[PDB]
Design an enzyme around this catalytic site. Sequence first.
Site, PDB file in Angstrom:
ATOM      1  N   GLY A  74      -2.186   5.745  -3.060  1.00 40.35           N
ATOM      2  CA  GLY A  74      -3.450   5.875  -3.765  1.00 40.35           C
ATOM      3  C   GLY A  74      -3.472   5.287  -5.162  1.00 40.35           C
ATOM      4  N   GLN A 105       6.449   5.799  -3.587  1.00 45.84           N
ATOM      5  CA  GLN A 105       6.446   5.501  -2.162  1.00 45.84           C
ATOM      6  C   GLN A 105       6.054   4.065  -1.859  1.00 45.84           C
ATOM      7  OE1 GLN A 105       7.989   7.565  -0.457  1.00 45.84           O
ATOM      8  NE2 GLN A 105       6.682   9.194   0.379  1.00 45.84           N
ATOM      9  N   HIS A 111      10.786   4.065  -0.818  1.00 44.15           N
ATOM     10  CA  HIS A 111      10.626   3.292   0.407  1.00 44.15           C
ATOM     11  C   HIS A 111      11.163   1.878   0.256  1.00 44.15           C
ATOM     12  CE1 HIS A 111       7.375   6.117   2.202  1.00 44.15           C
ATOM     13  NE2 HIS A 111       8.575   6.372   2.696  1.00 44.15           N
ATOM     14  N   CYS A 147      19.957 -11.253   2.973  1.00 42.10           N
ATOM     15  CA  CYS A 147      20.566 -11.626   4.237  1.00 42.10           C
ATOM     16  C   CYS A 147      21.010 -10.391   5.009  1.00 42.10           C
ATOM     17  CB  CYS A 147      21.767 -12.537   3.977  1.00 42.10           C
ATOM     18  SG  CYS A 147      22.557 -13.019   5.491  1.00 42.10           S
ATOM     19  N   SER A 192      -0.888  12.678  -1.072  1.00 43.93           N
ATOM     20  CA  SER A 192      -1.216  13.990  -0.539  1.00 43.93           C
ATOM     21  C   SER A 192       0.024  14.808  -0.196  1.00 43.93           C
ATOM     22  CB  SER A 192      -2.092  13.843   0.712  1.00 43.93           C
ATOM     23  OG  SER A 192      -3.424  13.475   0.390  1.00 43.93           O
ATOM     24  N   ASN A 197      -5.700  12.872  -7.192  1.00 37.89           N
ATOM     25  CA  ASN A 197      -5.733  12.488  -5.791  1.00 37.89           C
ATOM     26  C   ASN A 197      -7.131  12.714  -5.247  1.00 37.89           C
ATOM     27  OD1 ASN A 197      -4.016  11.337  -3.791  1.00 37.89           O
ATOM     28  ND2 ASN A 197      -4.170  13.245  -2.604  1.00 37.89           N
TER      29      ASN A 197
END
Length: 282
Positions: A31, A109, A129, A137, A205, A228
């Site tokens: 978000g 994230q 993430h 490679c 969230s 949010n």
Amino acid sequence: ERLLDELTLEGVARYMQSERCRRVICLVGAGISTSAGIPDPSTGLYDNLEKYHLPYPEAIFEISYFKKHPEPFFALAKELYPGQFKPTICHYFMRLLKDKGLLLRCYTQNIDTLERIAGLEQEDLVEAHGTFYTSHCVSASCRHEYPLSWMKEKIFSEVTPKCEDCQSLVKPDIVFFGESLPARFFSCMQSDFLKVDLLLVMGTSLQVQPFASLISKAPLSTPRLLINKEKAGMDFDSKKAYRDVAWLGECDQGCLALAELLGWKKELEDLVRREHASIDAQ
Ligand SMILES: [Zn+2]
């Protein structure tokens, strides 16, 4: 007991100005990048993949499938990859925290690198993430590293990125399905929240674990602000509510409102137009 005057954005701001608010952790999700054109997430991504004739739609982001058929991933990347990378108000709000010695961490994230573009450095970041910022490679005896400029030109030109030393496939350092979160996530979480004075949770969230569980690692007295589109994950409203605050709406507008209350708004908006202009020049 309550470290916050009142469960409002104003009380958060006042707390942020007390001597005790020294250490701030941002926890951010998709978000905070939507207003920059980055997608994601029931946004329809897996609903348009027929032309790639995949065994199942999520195979496009699965490590074992990718290593065998990388072309759908890289064709999808070219199709979805934005014309420019301009961080949002919310990104530049976080750089102000860095510039004023308030940012302990930004746990993100997102894989879009806007936090880095906005001026946060590796010590400031936990890319939960992974990231497109660097690629490697995939051969274990090689693991040659390639920068974003290199991976970007390979994706835009529709040339499957191959290692210039060993011709093996080169993968962006993002966490595919079937891969584990980076070690930096688990190592930094062990101590980052032991003594944090504020949690700022923006554009997520908190439906994704183990990232969502970070907010329960802070001290019980540490105030927590959520910016949010929807309330989730915290006790804003029960009879026991004492430290959590929800601002509902877009992340950019929420950060502007918080900025104003701190007297930071001029400084922030002047950072935005400026940095966005530098980017357009490039
Ligand atoms: Zn190689």
